[PDB]
Structure 1
Amino acid sequence: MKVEEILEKALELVIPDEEEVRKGREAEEELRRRLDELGVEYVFVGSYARNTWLKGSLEIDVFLLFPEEFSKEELRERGLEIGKAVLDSYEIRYAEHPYVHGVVKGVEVDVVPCYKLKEPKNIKSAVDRTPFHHKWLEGRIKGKENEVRLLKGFLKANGIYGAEYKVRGFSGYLCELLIVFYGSFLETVKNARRWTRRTVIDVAKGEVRKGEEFFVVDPVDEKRNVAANLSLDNLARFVHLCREFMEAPSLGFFKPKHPLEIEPERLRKIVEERGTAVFAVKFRKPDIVDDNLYPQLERASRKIFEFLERENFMPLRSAFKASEEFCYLLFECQIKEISRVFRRMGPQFEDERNVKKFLSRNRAFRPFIENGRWWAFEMRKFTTPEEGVRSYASTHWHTLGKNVGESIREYFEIISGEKLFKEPVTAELCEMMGVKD
């Protein structure tokens, strides 16, 4: 029931069993043949190549090596041809550049094209840095693969594994660098506890120093931060998870948390107990990829949150959720209703010039003096958050992200009350309000 005892049973969840392992080898096997039969220069990389892949995440990455002189276009065309010829089923995919994804003997395969080079410089695209990352890692990580898996399993179970924008967590490469640095998962966890937002980990120099931000310097490129897209709050959650784990080790830290859905009735009661304004902006989800969508949801969410705060509705927290169908921007405010009149600060009494201009405005209530300066009562255009966001979203749709904003412009509604509790957002709402149990 102590750390060691737990990490033992935890392996069971992160390490792939013989059947899954065999499936991958027989696949790498066949994949090899097909490529040699065309005599292509390739190099398996990624977690499959180093046996650092998490149980259930089997996927083979194959990078095709091309001469430095070949053209951008050449690589994609030939990469496509090759990928086409070797994959049972395929499907052009995209990221920095287009690439081929498919399945061989029942397993996911990625066929990426890149430039065969030597020495980190000369690099043209992040895909070229992958072989170097791989080289630096194969020798150093050998023998610690299960330590890598515990860390990945740990981060994954707590919703902070991937480095894509939907997650903003720890990339797999980062996890392997951490193991190489600390030696094991427990050592990584024990030290992470003393991590700060100013911590800088330098694998190449085997050093830990203070910086302006959390920086895990790439062994292959001292200027690149591997934890660049790890978010401040996600770094905080990890640090806090590590402290709690070392305090009360549990297998539970490696098991995915249950959705724990709730009945809209209890949710309705909670919001009533809160006395707050809970509402959502619902619009149609743009047909774009997560990497473009979620950063936009954050912006749209932030822009409106700041509108709510400068408009005095005392926002608490925000959230958002995407579906195949729609997107929801969720909000909770302390002010369900603010008055019509508010006070605008005017000039100091001595400034005759500005005072006259300030008093020249025809207002409904007659301005007054208070502690040396003039003030005026003014009337608002809206008195409820919902009412405010309807105005805001309607005229500032263009500042809520290029795609999200264009979608909001053509359609969006504001839901609240029971009507909201029926939408697919209860999970996000409970998280947002700290509903426990």
Structure 2
Amino acid sequence: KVEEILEKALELVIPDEEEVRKGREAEEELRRRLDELGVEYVFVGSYARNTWLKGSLEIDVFLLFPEEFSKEELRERGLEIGKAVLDEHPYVHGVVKGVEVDVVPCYKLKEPKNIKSAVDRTPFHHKWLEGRIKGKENEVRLLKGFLKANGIYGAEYKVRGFSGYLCELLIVFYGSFLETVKNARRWTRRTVIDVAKGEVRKGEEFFVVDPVDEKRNVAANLSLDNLARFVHLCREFMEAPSLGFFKPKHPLEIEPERLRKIVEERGTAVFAVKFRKPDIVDDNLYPQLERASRKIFEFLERENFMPLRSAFKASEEFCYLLFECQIKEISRVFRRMGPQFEDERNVKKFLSRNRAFRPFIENGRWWAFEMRKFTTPEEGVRSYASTHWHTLGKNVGESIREYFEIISGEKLFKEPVTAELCEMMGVKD
């Protein structure tokens, strides 16, 4: 059955003529414009190697240069060859014949001499792959489609999954999609896949050695949990192959009343911190949302609200930090630790404070009943976000400093976070 399933999967991952047409049209046209300017360039994307996933057409053209500052010479070229345009790091993005195109500067290099490397490597990545991926393009597509349908294709921080480069290296290492999944069933968090040496060994962390640069982990951005999810999916697929593994899962359709019912049944405190989304790119925002979520989670743990799990969502205008806690309310009174009975001066100090109830000795130490300044996790977070917003990421914290609100109940359910809430609580269809 497996072999038959992969055949049907091909219809979902391979681009259809009409988009493959747009690519061709745009490529010829882009070459014409580049040639006329006598520009030295090379197509290095997934498009150039016909390994791009259906519906994901885009062109990556790198411009080869020797000098130091040409950040502007590229500004020109890109701006001149692109029908429409927008924006060391800086590059030109636009469209040509209706196709997305990235125009990046870099040094035409006499091989491995990557200057303040990053963009200078890409051409080598393409060179190494070009002659080794031929004939296995669709294998790469099945891999990408499999990953995408399961939300783990993409190395951007929003996804923390598998980069396209990583997918091609895997296909080259194992030979095909099927073989990649069969072997991935045995990957561990210490697995080192050294492509250039054709070997697998144990290491400190999951590491896929870049054949172009040994010290670089091509899977640097693949999170531990998405590696885990992939290994599991691979095991599940081989156990019972289904075309469904290549199909995106469908958004759980649930009314607010049913969400309220689930929450009331779990008996937890479910709430969110809502604030304006700061004007920064995803690769900057997402790590800040993860940090903010973690700090508040840690605050909730420390304050004994027993948080279960957290999650976040970035909409067009707002961001949401979601939490579920096992404690909806904690007592006003708490135990404040005092000094050992021996320390006379500190004991007098500890006892000099006015309190509603008398302190006491326990296990040779003084203790006092004191009052919390909040009794619900929502009140705890209102306090934390009001004075400790600086710990929530530079831009996320600054937005929260200006404005935030804690929402729960039907109000919360109305926000565009239902999918994140369901996922967080493990709600099923």
Q: Same-fold call, TM > 0.5?
A: yes
CA gap 1:288/1:69 in 2 versus in 1, 3 angstroms: closer
Query: Is the 1:345–1:375 Cα contact (8 Å) retained in structure 2?
Result: yes
Counterparts of 1:85 and 1:384 in 2: how far apart (Å)? 53
What do residues 241-281 of structure 1 show as CA deviations (whole Å, max 9, x unaligned)? 11111111100000011112211111111111011111111
Query: Is the 1:34–1:86 Cα contact (8 Å) retained in structure 2?
Result: no
Q: CA deviation at 1:214?
A: 0.9
3-state SS in 2 of match to 1:167 = coil
Counterparts of 1:87 and 1:347 in 2: how far apart (Å)? 64
Counterparts of 2:83 and 2:175 in 1: how far apart (Å)? 40
What do residues 335-356 of structure 1 show as CA deviations (whole Å, max 9, x unaligned)? 1110011112333334445444
> In terms of mean alpha carbon deviation, does 351-360 or 302-311 score higher?
351-360
CA gap 1:333/1:139 in 2 versus in 1, 3 angstroms: same
Counterparts of 2:86 and 2:75 in 1: how far apart (Å)? 16
> In terms of mean alpha carbon deviation, does 34-43 or 17-26 score higher?
17-26
Counterparts of 1:288 and 1:238 in 2: how far apart (Å)? 30
CA gap 1:417/1:194 in 2 versus in 1, 3 angstroms: same
Query: Is the 1:6–1:251 Cα contact (8 Å) retained in structure 2?
Result: yes
Q: CA deviation at 1:66?
A: 1.4
Q: CA deviation at 1:369?
A: 2.1
Query: Is the 1:279–1:331 Cα contact (8 Å) retained in structure 2?
Result: yes
Q: CA deviation at 1:430?
A: 0.5
Q: CA deviation at 1:111?
A: 1.6
Query: Is the 2:359–2:367 Cα contact (8 Å) retained in structure 1?
Result: yes
**1:25: which partner in 2?**
24
Q: CA deviation at 1:70?
A: 5.0
Counterparts of 2:425 and 2:297 in 1: how far apart (Å)? 16
Q: CA deviation at 1:24?
A: 1.7
Counterparts of 1:373 and 1:392 in 2: how far apart (Å)? 30
Q: CA deviation at 1:373?
A: 2.6
3-state SS in 1 of match to 2:275 = strand
Counterparts of 1:327 and 1:69 in 2: how far apart (Å)? 40
2:97 to 84, 105, 109: 105
Counterparts of 2:411 and 2:16 in 1: how far apart (Å)? 46
3-state SS in 2 of match to 1:217 = strand
Query: Is the 2:312–2:320 Cα contact (8 Å) retained in structure 1?
Result: yes
Counterparts of 1:289 and 1:87 in 2: how far apart (Å)? 14
**1:134: which partner in 2?**
126
3-state SS in 1 of match to 2:46 = helix
Gaps of 5+ in 1: 89-95
Query: Is the 1:66–1:114 Cα contact (8 Å) retained in structure 2?
Result: yes
What do residues 220-256 of structure 1 show as CA deviations (whole Å, max 9, x unaligned)? 1111111111111111111111111111110000001
Matched, 1:175 2:167: yes
Counterparts of 2:110 and 2:364 in 1: how far apart (Å)? 72
Counterparts of 2:391 and 2:6 in 1: how far apart (Å)? 48
Q: CA deviation at 1:210?
A: 1.0
- The normalised TM-score by structure 2 is 0.95
CA gap 1:121/1:355 in 2 versus in 1, 3 angstroms: farther
CA gap 1:119/1:341 in 2 versus in 1, 3 angstroms: same
Query: Is the 1:87–1:104 Cα contact (8 Å) retained in structure 2?
Result: no
3-state SS in 2 of match to 1:227 = coil
Query: Is the 1:349–1:372 Cα contact (8 Å) retained in structure 2?
Result: yes
CA gap 1:105/1:227 in 2 versus in 1, 3 angstroms: same
Identity value in percent: 100
Counterparts of 2:149 and 2:227 in 1: how far apart (Å)? 15
Counterparts of 2:373 and 2:172 in 1: how far apart (Å)? 59
Q: CA deviation at 1:85?
A: 9.6
Q: CA deviation at 1:304?
A: 0.7
What do residues 178-210 of structure 1 show as CA deviations (whole Å, max 9, x unaligned)? 111111111111111111111111101111111
Over the aligned positions, Cα root-mean-square deviation in angstroms equals: 2.0
CA gap 1:434/1:86 in 2 versus in 1, 3 angstroms: closer
CA gap 1:183/1:62 in 2 versus in 1, 3 angstroms: same
Query: Is the 2:252–2:428 Cα contact (8 Å) retained in structure 1?
Result: no
3-state SS in 1 of match to 2:67 = coil
Counterparts of 1:53 and 1:73 in 2: how far apart (Å)? 30
Q: CA deviation at 1:37?
A: 1.9
What do residues 287-314 of structure 1 show as CA deviations (whole Å, max 9, x unaligned)? 1111111111111111111111100111
CA gap 1:25/1:75 in 2 versus in 1, 3 angstroms: closer
Q: CA deviation at 1:62?
A: 1.1
Q: CA deviation at 1:86?
A: 10
Query: Is the 1:79–1:113 Cα contact (8 Å) retained in structure 2?
Result: no
**2:194: which partner in 1?**
202
Query: Is the 2:82–2:96 Cα contact (8 Å) retained in structure 1?
Result: no
CA gap 1:342/1:85 in 2 versus in 1, 3 angstroms: closer
Query: Is the 2:84–2:96 Cα contact (8 Å) retained in structure 1?
Result: no
Counterparts of 2:18 and 2:81 in 1: how far apart (Å)? 29
CA gap 1:48/1:395 in 2 versus in 1, 3 angstroms: same
Matched, 1:224 2:223: no
- The normalised TM-score by structure 1 is 0.94
- Within 5 Å, give how 1:74-85 maps onto structure 2: 74-83=73-82
Gaps of 5+ in 2: none
3-state SS in 2 of match to 1:49 = coil
Q: CA deviation at 1:363?
A: 2.7
CA gap 1:118/1:85 in 2 versus in 1, 3 angstroms: farther
Counterparts of 1:259 and 1:120 in 2: how far apart (Å)? 46
Q: CA deviation at 1:115?
A: 1.3
Query: Is the 2:33–2:81 Cα contact (8 Å) retained in structure 1?
Result: no
Matched, 1:234 2:226: yes
CA gap 1:97/1:380 in 2 versus in 1, 3 angstroms: same
CA gap 1:101/1:144 in 2 versus in 1, 3 angstroms: same
Q: CA deviation at 1:17?
A: 2.5
Q: CA deviation at 1:27?
A: 2.2
Query: Is the 2:272–2:321 Cα contact (8 Å) retained in structure 1?
Result: yes
CA gap 1:85/1:355 in 2 versus in 1, 3 angstroms: closer
Count of residue pairs the alignment pairs up: 429
3-state SS in 1 of match to 2:406 = strand
**2:259: which partner in 1?**
267
